[PDB]
Amino acid sequence: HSVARVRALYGEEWRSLMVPSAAILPYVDVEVTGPDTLKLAECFQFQEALAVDRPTLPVVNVPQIERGEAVLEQGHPHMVLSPDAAELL
Amino acid sequence: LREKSHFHSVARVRALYGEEWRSLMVPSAAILPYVDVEVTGPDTLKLAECFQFQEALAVDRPTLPVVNVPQIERGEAVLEQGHPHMVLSPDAAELLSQWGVALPEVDEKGQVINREAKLEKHGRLFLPLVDPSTNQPFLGFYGEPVMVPNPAVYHSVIAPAILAYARRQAALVDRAKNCYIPPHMDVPPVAPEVLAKITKLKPGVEKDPQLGELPVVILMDDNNTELARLPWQVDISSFSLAQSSMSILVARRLGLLA
Amino acid sequence: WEYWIQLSLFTADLHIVGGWNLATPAQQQLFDAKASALKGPIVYSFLDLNELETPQSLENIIAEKRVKSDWRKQIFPSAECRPPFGFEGNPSGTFHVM
Amino acid sequence: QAIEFYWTALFCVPENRMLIRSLRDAEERLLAEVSCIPHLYKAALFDSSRFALATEIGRRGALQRPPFLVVKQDKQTVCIAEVPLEPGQLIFRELPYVCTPLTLEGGQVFTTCFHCLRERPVSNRGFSCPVSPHTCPFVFCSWECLMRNVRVHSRECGLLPMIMAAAREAELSITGVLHFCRLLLRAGLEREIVRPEKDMLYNVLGELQSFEESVEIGQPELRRKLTTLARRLEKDFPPGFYCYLQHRELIRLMLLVSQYSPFVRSTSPSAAVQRRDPDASVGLVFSRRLANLPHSCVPTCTYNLDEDGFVAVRALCHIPVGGRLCVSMVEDLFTPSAARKDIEAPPRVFGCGCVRCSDPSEGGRMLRGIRCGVCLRGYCAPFYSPALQKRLVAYGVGGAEVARKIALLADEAEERWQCTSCGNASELLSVQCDAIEREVTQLTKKADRRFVKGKSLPARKIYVDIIRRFNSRLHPNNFLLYNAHVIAAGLLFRDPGQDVPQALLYIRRAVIAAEAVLPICHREKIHLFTQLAQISFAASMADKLSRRGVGLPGGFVLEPMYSAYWNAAVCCGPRSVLALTTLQQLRMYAAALNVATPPAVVSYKLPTVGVIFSYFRHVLGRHTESDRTLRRLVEKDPFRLATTIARLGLHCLMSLEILSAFNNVHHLGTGLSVMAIAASQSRLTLVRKLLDAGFDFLRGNELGVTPLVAMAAMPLPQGGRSVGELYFRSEVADRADRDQAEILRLFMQECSRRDARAKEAKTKDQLMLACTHRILGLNGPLHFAAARGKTELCRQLIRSGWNVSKSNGEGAVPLHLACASGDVQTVMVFLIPVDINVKTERGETPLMLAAYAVQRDMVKLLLDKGADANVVGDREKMTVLHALAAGVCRTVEVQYEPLDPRQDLAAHVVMGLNHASLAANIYNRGPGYLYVTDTVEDRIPVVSQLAPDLFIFPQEILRRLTEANHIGEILLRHCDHQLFVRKTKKGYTPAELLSHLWERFFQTRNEVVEQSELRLAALSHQERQEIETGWKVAGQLAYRLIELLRAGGATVEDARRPEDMTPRRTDLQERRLRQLHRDAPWLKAEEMLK
Amino acid sequence: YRVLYRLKRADQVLPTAVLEFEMKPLRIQVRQPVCEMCEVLPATLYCPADRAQLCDTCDERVHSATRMLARHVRVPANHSPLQFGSCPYHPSEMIDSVCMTCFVALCPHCILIGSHSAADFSEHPLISTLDAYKMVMQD
Amino acid sequence: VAPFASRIFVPVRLMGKDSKFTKREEALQARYAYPEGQFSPGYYVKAADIDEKRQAILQARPPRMSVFEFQEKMRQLKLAKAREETERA
Amino acid sequence: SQQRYSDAMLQALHSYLLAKSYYTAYQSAPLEGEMVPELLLLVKCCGL
Amino acid sequence: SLFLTLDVLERKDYQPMSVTLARYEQASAQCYGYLRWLLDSSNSSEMQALEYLQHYPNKKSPAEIFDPDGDLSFSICHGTPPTKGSNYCTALDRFISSLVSKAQVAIIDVRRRLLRGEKPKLGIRLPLDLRSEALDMLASLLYHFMDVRIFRQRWRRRFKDSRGAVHAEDR
């Protein structure tokens, strides 16, 4: 009768904004095994044997390709002192 | 997992919520078989030439979005059947609020009412975008035209009035008695009668001598009256949402392919 | 007492918050012996405080020392109780029963 | 300080009862005065009106300006302010230029997209690599990103091992280098398209601050390994990889990446609605305008990565005119000062002059405090080591020249401790407090490896051992102590454990330690405050297990959720998914405690209740009480009066005066306004009285639920009296449906009076414009009525003018939601004049949802009116028998929702424990109480596993096969023979798809029975006999249905699928034509005309 | 089954108690068991004869040493009696025992300090709650 | 369009009138206000300098004072100044 | 194999009776020897 | 268990007619601490019961707990017929059996008054206004003369062995 049924409708208040979708999902097993290429990317070594770092000799004369872009005098390279050679001197 | 980004805050949120550190992880041999994909060829690379072309050309050649956009992802409808939900675009809501015009609304059947009153003295600021060749607006979703904001109203009235009226009155009173923010700032208002007569838009390329391919927009009214030479190249991302187009043919029609 | 009200209302949601025995345990024993002297059993009647002949609140019955209701012309609901008065306005609310 | 003095007395005399009791009293008083948002910000969140000449253009065009100017004092990037910034104000709102996730060793992916740090929108769908489409991992997610980043991956895919070996020679963060090379590739491919004088990379180097000379002479190990990587980067790479950049300038750019790129957390929209963890991935992003800020460990701004994928910052404090805008580069700002200024720290972090990093006791936060025994009061703070200090004077004032002057002209690892009460800096204090410091760090690292390998029980055991043993030796703000509090509180709420009140301690001291140290708003304060109120509500429940009184009051469970919502608005967004899901948590918790009044500005009082007891006792039926006893109810909850009147519809003149004041406030329990809850139940006489008196009927809540939407959202009241295809339904349902039709009609006349008086502000269109956020899937009012089986409501919705073919969410027509409800009459009225065949974006018909639910009279009804039984999907290739298969044995219901009513303890309390909730799988009669079940999938169409009565008892299965066999029989004479062989996306005929899903249902059956519930143990031999007869017959009908879906297709000679047929010319041409029809829909007008 | 009674006498109605209640459910906090000697793994199998809950690594060292311990039947851990538990008189100890002559739920601390603490047994039978649940279902 | 709200409600717009709430509001918004100089203003500046910090941490404490001396200060402050103020008045 | 010994009763007995019902009408021989596998299940689970 | 029943009894909340004031404040949803029973019922009762002895208000010093005129010295002296005949009924085995019996008579009488409510007349302070000389005699004996190693040894093996500890009681 009442008390139990009408309390169930007060449970229907907070299920009002709750709608069945149109998803039809057929869950079928898919297996994981195969070549793992992030393994192969992270197991790879270089063969040059770069030595330890020492104080360096900067090259004084070089075309000015400062900050990537190519500055020209009026259309030709304008051979000039490099900034790291200015730092050494 | 030896970093100052593990072993810390990213894990104390998770163990608070009662899951494991064994999760959030998957080897990269289960990402592919679980998530099916369809092939992308060189045409996705060639199409991506002109998406960075909108982004890089930002401070000088501002983009023009489409307010007639759906909530559905492209490439699923046919544009004569199927009735998706109409919405105003996110980047169009940002741009319209940035320029200083009221936010409009898009109806269910795709027509945008104009909640403004200043427009009537100098034409229309919400006009359909029209095909360059056949001179008819693009039928967007149910037959109604794809419509975009008009920069002709924008550069003529609003754009000089922000700097000249508002900023000069504020500076000469606050600083004296007690920066160049808006973009473009180029060719002046042409004529108030040109402002009065405008209804159509056209994505063209132009700009030959020292630019090569810098697309502009051609502005028309009724029997092909070429009036305004405003830059404002169209947003290819919002246009492709409006057409559910999915491939290179948008850059062919819009001229953005280079 | 909670399982009593749960039985009377068909509701596995009702849970007791408190109680007040308005009778001494010696008085409960005297009433039990008088009932067996009458050769009759004892039935629990779960009434609303406002269903009685004259309604009293909890603060009314404690202060005045008497529940002033003529039990002769009074009708006692047994077993199934009606929903307590108010109910369908605030179903997940607090009520009283005597 | 009251906590401080109670703690030292606990160190003097342990236990002592009154010491640990007055400590617990003083801490929860302190929490009650710090966990409260100001009432003005409180009402601003629940205002609900937000979600409802040339000078004038100048005024509103200038009070929208970007509130920042990038000014250039010295070499810095000082950002100044011009407008009074309220907290929660959006400032920059840009794109992320380039981003990388947390790549790590072991070949592990964060199960999100490698690009575009987001949750994938569809878990079983994605885009592909250009170079190696399906051998390379890291599939893309959307077409907004495949156009964004396909060339930066084309240059990177072949060189991924090339950069992997570079990062291990020069030891670095692998994410720190992989972001940098992405910045090189993307900027390099931008130099191809722009003229070579202006670029963003041209702007970054030259205009940003770029600590260089502070790196050469200070923390020199930073410079040497960046040189090791750059020397490698120059010689076995193409010169265009680094944009032809110099070696010295390469060192500049590598510092430019490390010191301007923050760790962001990608919140996910599906785990937010599923109540699980947000922040599913973490990684670097870079933006130009984001990098134009100065770093400070005391922020005025916090950055985020939004769900639409826009990096933006908001306002924390109340930055006035001439203010500063600062973000923390440090992702964990609670990290101690020594690890902030770590040798591996970015240079911008390493040089920072905030009060926490200059004052030794972290600016009064006192994050490193260990008990000083000389004075036995107060705690001693550490200092920077002399080795650190010598290398650190290169960043402040003229730090460059003071550094070189000491270098030419002229115990180190040990750092001193200083007490802040009596001032003692002895070697005794620096070996005693060092001894405590090493012991707690070693213990926290021991559980750090214990938790990471997954052995969670001993990880909690030794964290709790830290909290119980050292404890008073530690200040209540330590990095060791608070990290022990948060882990042990979560692992004593989930995991085996949860004694429960000991976790209530550990989350309570965690929230206090977080608010005194972390900034005013933070992302982590969303999580800590949510679990503080969750354990508080569970401790209120465990008290109600014990002696049954009051429990914790409503303040201790609501206010932590309120601060969690305010931090959700400031940090993540006022309209993001995380803020809305925490708000649904707030409303569900408010309904359990029965508070029912949103905190607002109005707070309408009634100071004359004592006379109108003739009406107040009438509405709640209680004719007993006195003056003061319900005068409590009007001050504590004025709005419960409005809700009881709206649900129990009274049309008196006094009733209209009562409801007239309460209009703008919606609710706190469910968020429906006064009229909205009045019309949700059929109260036609009250609804008429409100509309003709001018009540608001158009605004919606935060999700967008207008009163008409909530009206159709209400389940139809069933279970009443008597009866009414044998389509009988209760007269309570009959009167409810027809009165709600009259309510919708009165809505239409109320539009007509407000729209015939004048023009514009078209209330007709605003009533049709009523949909919801994608969390519920863009559902409209016609959609809601179709899913609820309301026949008379959707008939009036059709007549008034709502579109029958309107779509929501996953392309669903209302006929889809009507056949999902199972009501025959709702399906009929949607096709009385039609779309008897129609497809979604997945490609399903109403017939295939009819076979999924396995309903006999629904499949028969559609087949009579002309449903095409040969429709194959274009995205799944899934047919009507493919829907009957796996609908025979489905283990997952897919359901839209605002939050889970499955794991909330508050959802069981609010919504109740009855037959209706058990059928909706709200609570569960399963083995565990709540725990954490199988995660299935993270989709915004939230998938949820069904109750474990499907697997145990053979009642639902045996019932389902009987009409599944009959549906196969009625479809046998209607379907063709080609569909019996047609394959799905996994290569299955409809016959052996059913055989395969029967085996998978059998494997899950043996798994569920083995884990078991004690209902199986408590079984008589007769009931065990009846179960095993049930599953033998269930296997009998399963094979009988398999032979039914197989033997029909055995009379066809063609086994090859139709797309593998050798084709006949015109089908090649027309597939090319319809491809260009969808590709270029604009060529139609130019074709037929010209 | 609604019955309405009218009593002739007013010396026949003794009111007993005023009871106030809330209408919202109250679920028992349930605790699926953990291993006894080492709280390092969740319990997987509970042996009723040993009345103890163990994991897989501990079942093979307790019962797999002598021969009389290998004969013990072991049930899954969700049959454990300790999952019913608060013993609300003394919280944080779980109900393992149900008195059958009293129909009351007790814990080990609740039999030493609480209700069934004085001289008793041989008139107070107690069992495990797993057995008690078996008799309700099999009526 | 407005509901034409009733006269039987007294709103009162919750602003400063009633002491306890008028200081609780400003206490809670004091934490949300702009801090003074606490940020990183570019350049570092260190004030750690251990030896003056012994004095700079003393620096604020109340006077260190015994109860037997407290009784004699409250006698000389109450009794003597009362004799002065009664003589003046 | 694991711990049950009572569900293994009923599934073995059911495969016994369902095989036997086929083996009394397909051919006139109730025992056919192929029911040995679950016969071994029946005796061992009865004794345990 | 005499001292653990006292430990549980003092730990319970007792309060005046503000019970009904807190019921009205439950529907609203002193004010400083509400939940106290549940918070401190988290550690073992072994720790709490020993410190219940530790802070007992009025105990007896060792000098006069062996008062040569007192009742403890009396029960070892005069009386107590010597161990002859059968069984083992030695001197203080009878008297700290009589003190335990008398202490239950007081403590049960206290619990009966707490069920009525009997609010006290408006430290560790005991339940209602006790003059409990038998409880004080037993408290001091447990306070000066035992060691905690075997108190923990046999009572940890009593709580988690509630079956074996009560069967070895009779056998």
Q: What is D384-414 written as a DSSP string?
A: --HHHHHHHTTSSSSHHHHHHHHHHH---S-
Structure tokens at E2: 């609604």
CA–CA distance, D589 with D911 (Å, rounded to integer): 11
The sheet carrying D281-286 orders its strands as: D98-101, D281-286, D263-266, D303-305, D311-313
CA–CA distance, D850 with D827 (Å, rounded to integer): 11
Q: Where are the alpha helices (DSSP H) in chain B?
A: 9-16, 31-34, 42-47, 51-56, 90-99, 151-153, 159-161, 168-177, 192-196, 236-243, 249-254
CA–CA distance, G7 with B198 (Å, rounded to integer): 83
CB-based contact D367:D336 (threshold 8 Å) = yes
Alpha carbon of C89: minimum distance to chain D alpha carbons (Å): 4
Q: Where are the alpha helices (DSSP H) in D649-701?
A: 653-661, 674-680, 684-691
For D219, what's the count of Cα atoms within 13 Å in the CB-facing half-sphere? 21
> Which of D550, D908, D1014, D1022 best probes binding to E when mutated, by most E CB atoms within 10 angstroms?
D1014
Cα torsion for D822, D826, D830, D831, to the nearest 10°?
80
CB-based contact D360:F56 (threshold 8 Å) = no
Q: What is the DSSP letter of D419?
A: E
Q: What is D755-796 written as a DSSP string?
A: HHSSSSS-HHHHHH-----TTTTS--HHHHHHHTT-HHHHHH
Chain centre distance of CA B255: 16
Alpha carbon of E83: minimum distance to chain D alpha carbons (Å): 9
CB-based contact B3:B11 (threshold 8 Å) = no
Sign of CA dihedral F37, F39, F44, F45: positive
CA–CA distance, D727 with D357 (Å, rounded to integer): 75
CA–CA distance, D173 with H15 (Å, rounded to integer): 61
Q: Helices D856-865 & D846-853, crossing angle to 10 degrees? A: 160
Q: How many CB atoms lie within 10 A of CB D203?
A: 13
- If you search the block for the tokens 């070189």, which residue do you land on? D404
Nearest by CB to residue D354, choosing from F5, F32, F40, is F40
- If you search the block for the tokens 């760090």, which residue do you land on? D441
Residue C20 is inside which H or E element, if any? Answer: strand C14-21
- If you search the block for the tokens 């047929």, which residue do you land on? D1061
Q: Where are the beta strands (DSSP E) in D314-410?
A: 370-371, 379-382
Nearest by CB to residue E78, choosing from D497, D1013, D1019, is D1013
Q: Is D129 helix (H, G, I), strand (E, B) or coil?
A: coil
Whole-number Cα distances in Å, G29 to D177, E90, G23, G36, G41: 78, 67, 6, 15, 22
E26 CB neighbours in chain C (<8 A) are 15
- If you search the block for the tokens 């070429």, which residue do you land on? B226
Q: What is D715-736 written as a DSSP string?
A: PP--S-SS--------HHHHHH
A18–D contact, CB cutoff 8 A: yes
H116–E contact, CB cutoff 8 A: no
Q: How many CB atoms lie within 10 A of CB B247?
A: 18
CA–CA distance, D93 with D97 (Å, rounded to integer): 13
Alpha carbon of C32: minimum distance to chain D alpha carbons (Å): 29
CB-based contact F43:D399 (threshold 8 Å) = yes
Neighbouring-strand partners of residue E98: E105, E127
Show the CA angle centred on residue H37, arms to residues H32 and H38, nearest 5°.
100
Q: Helices D2-12 & D18-34, crossing angle to 10 degrees? A: 160
- If you search the block for the tokens 């139940």, which residue do you land on? D681
Nearest by CB to residue B28, choosing from A31, A33, A37, is A37
Q: Is D1037 helix (H, G, I), strand (E, B) or coil?
A: helix
Phi-psi region for residue F42, left (φ > 0), alpha (ψ -120 to 50) or beta?
left
Q: Is D620 helix (H, G, I), strand (E, B) or coil?
A: coil
CA–CA distance, H83 with B31 (Å, rounded to integer): 86
How would you classify the pairing of strands E75-76 and D98-101? unpaired
CB-based contact B54:B236 (threshold 8 Å) = yes
Q: Helices D174-191 & D160-169, crossing angle to 10 degrees? A: 130
Using only C-alpha atoms, chain A has a radius of gyration, in whole angstroms, of 36
Using only C-alpha atoms, chain C has a radius of gyration, in whole angstroms, of 15
Using only C-alpha atoms, chain E has a radius of gyration, in whole angstroms, of 21
- If you search the block for the tokens 């953990």, which residue do you land on? E34
Using only C-alpha atoms, chain F has a radius of gyration, in whole angstroms, of 27
Do G and B share at least 3 CB pairs under 8 Å?
Answer: no
CA–CA distance, G8 with G14 (Å, rounded to integer): 10
CB-based contact E28:D545 (threshold 8 Å) = yes
CA–CA distance, H29 with D636 (Å, rounded to integer): 8
CB-based contact D1034:D1026 (threshold 8 Å) = no
Report the candidate in D441, D474, D454, D392 with the shortest Cα–Cα distance to residue D214.
D392
- In angstroms, the first-to-last Cα distance of chain B is 45
D693 φ/ψ angles, rounded to the nearest 5 degrees: -95, 5
Q: What is D890-917 written as a DSSP string?
A: --EEEB--SS-TTT-HHHHHHH-SSHHH
Q: What is the DSSP letter of D874?
A: S
Report the candidate in H80, A51, B184 with the shortest Cα–Cα distance to residue D235.
A51
Q: Where are the beta strands (DSSP E) in D343-500?
A: 370-371, 379-382, 417-419
The verdict on a CB contact (< 8 Å) between H55 and D636 is: no
Q: Where chain A is broken, by preceding residue (C–N > 2.5 Å)?
A: none
CB-based contact D901:D916 (threshold 8 Å) = no
CA–CA distance, E75 with E70 (Å, rounded to integer): 14
Structure tokens at D632: 């409590």
With a CB-CB cutoff of 8 Å, which residues 3-62 of chain B face chain A? Answer: 27-30, 32-34
Structure tokens at E81: 């009696």
Report the candidate in D109, D12, D32, D528 with the shortest Cα–Cα distance to residue D278.
D528
Structure tokens at B153: 């109203």
G6–D contact, CB cutoff 8 A: yes
Nearest by CB to residue D128, choosing from B1, B38, B157, is B38
Q: Is D691 helix (H, G, I), strand (E, B) or coil?
A: helix
Whole-number Cα distances in Å, G44 to E76, G10, G30: 21, 13, 22
Q: How many CB atoms lie within 10 A of CB F29?
A: 16
Q: Where are the beta strands (DSSP E) in D918-981?
A: 943-945
Sign of CA dihedral B125, B126, B132, B136: negative
The verdict on a CB contact (< 8 Å) between D1010 and G11 is: no
Identity of the amino acid at D853: A
Structure tokens at D507: 């989350």
D519-529 burial: b if 16+ Cβ within 10 Å, else e: bbbbbbbbbbb
Q: How many CB atoms lie within 10 A of CB D874?
A: 11
CB-based contact D883:D869 (threshold 8 Å) = no
Q: How many CB atoms lie within 10 A of CB E107?
A: 25
Phi-psi region for residue D571, left (φ > 0), alpha (ψ -120 to 50) or beta?
alpha
Q: How many CB atoms lie within 10 A of CB D1089?
A: 9
Show the CA angle centred on residue D177, arms to residues D171 and D179, nearest 5°.
160
Structure tokens at D10: 């606990």
Burial, F46: exposed, middle or buried (Cβ in 10 Å; 0-12, 13-18, 19+)? middle
B112–D contact, CB cutoff 8 A: no
CA–CA distance, D699 with B174 (Å, rounded to integer): 41
Q: Where are the alpha helices (DSSP H) in D988-1064?
A: 990-1011, 1014-1017, 1021-1047
CB-based contact C53:C73 (threshold 8 Å) = yes
Largest CA distance in chain A: 100
Contacts of B7 (CB under 8 A, 6+ apart): B1, D448, D452
Q: What is H107-141 written as a DSSP string?
A: HHHHHHHHHH----------STT---HHHHHHHHH
For D159, what's the count of Cα atoms within 13 Å in the CB-facing half-sphere? 18
D546-561 burial: b if 16+ Cβ within 10 Å, else e: bebbbbbbbbbbbbbb
CA–CA distance, D298 with D898 (Å, rounded to integer): 35
CA–CA distance, B236 with B245 (Å, rounded to integer): 11
CA–CA distance, H58 with H79 (Å, rounded to integer): 29
Contacts of D155 (CB under 8 A, 6+ apart): D185, D188, D189
Chain centre distance of CA D809: 18
Q: Where are the alpha helices (DSSP H) in chain C?
A: 2-9, 25-37, 58-64
D144–G contact, CB cutoff 8 A: no
- If you search the block for the tokens 């209640």, which residue do you land on? E21
With a CB-CB cutoff of 8 Å, which residues 229-258 of chain B face chain D? Answer: 237, 243-247, 249, 253
Whole-number Cα distances in Å, B174 to B177, D36, D1063: 6, 39, 80
CA–CA distance, D575 with D217 (Å, rounded to integer): 47
Residue D303 is inside which H or E element, if any? Answer: strand D303-305
Cα torsion for D481, D483, D486, D492, to the nearest 10°?
-80
CA–CA distance, D419 with D458 (Å, rounded to integer): 35
The sheet carrying E52-54 orders its strands as: E52-54, E45-47, E75-76
Q: Is D598 helix (H, G, I), strand (E, B) or coil?
A: coil
CA–CA distance, D674 with B54 (Å, rounded to integer): 49
Neighbouring chains to C with at least 3 Cβ pairs closer than 8 Å: A, D, E, H
Q: Is D943 helix (H, G, I), strand (E, B) or coil?
A: strand
Neighbouring-strand partners of residue B83: D806
The verdict on a CB contact (< 8 Å) between H42 and D539 is: no
CA–CA distance, D884 with D974 (Å, rounded to integer): 15
Neighbouring-strand partners of residue D126: B37
Q: How many CB atoms lie within 10 A of CB B238?
A: 22
Identity of the amino acid at H168: A
Largest CA distance in chain E: 75
Alpha carbon of D680: minimum distance to chain B alpha carbons (Å): 25
Neighbouring-strand partners of residue B234: B64
Residue H153 is inside which H or E element, if any? Answer: helix H148-159
Q: Where are the alpha helices (DSSP H) in F31-66?
A: 50-58
Alpha carbon of B32: minimum distance to chain A alpha carbons (Å): 9
CA–CA distance, D505 with H38 (Å, rounded to integer): 11
Whole-number Cα distances in Å, B6 to B13, D114, D277, D747: 12, 18, 16, 57
CA–CA distance, A41 with B53 (Å, rounded to integer): 33
Identity of the amino acid at D700: G
Show the CA angle centred on residue D551, arms to residues H52 and D643, nearest 5°.
170
CA–CA distance, H131 with H128 (Å, rounded to integer): 9
Reported for B108-117, long-range contacts at CB under 8 A and 24+ positions apart, including other chains, are: B108/D765, B108/D768, B108/D769, B108/D803, B108/D806, B109/B142, B109/B144, B110/B68, B110/B86, B110/B140, B110/B141, B110/B142, B110/B144, B111/B144, B112/B67, B112/B68, B112/B88, B112/B147, B113/D762
CA–CA distance, D440 with D433 (Å, rounded to integer): 11
The verdict on a CB contact (< 8 Å) between E3 and C15 is: no
Alpha carbon of C98: minimum distance to chain A alpha carbons (Å): 18
Burial, B243: exposed, middle or buried (Cβ in 10 Å; 0-12, 13-18, 19+)? buried
D964 φ/ψ angles, rounded to the nearest 5 degrees: -75, -35
For C31, what's the count of Cα atoms within 13 Å in the CB-facing half-sphere? 17
Q: What is the DSSP letter of E30?
A: B
Structure tokens at E19: 């009871």
CA–CA distance, D113 with D120 (Å, rounded to integer): 7
CA–CA distance, D222 with D394 (Å, rounded to integer): 14
CA–CA distance, B52 with D187 (Å, rounded to integer): 11
Q: What is the DSSP letter of B139?
A: B
**How determined?**
cryo-EM
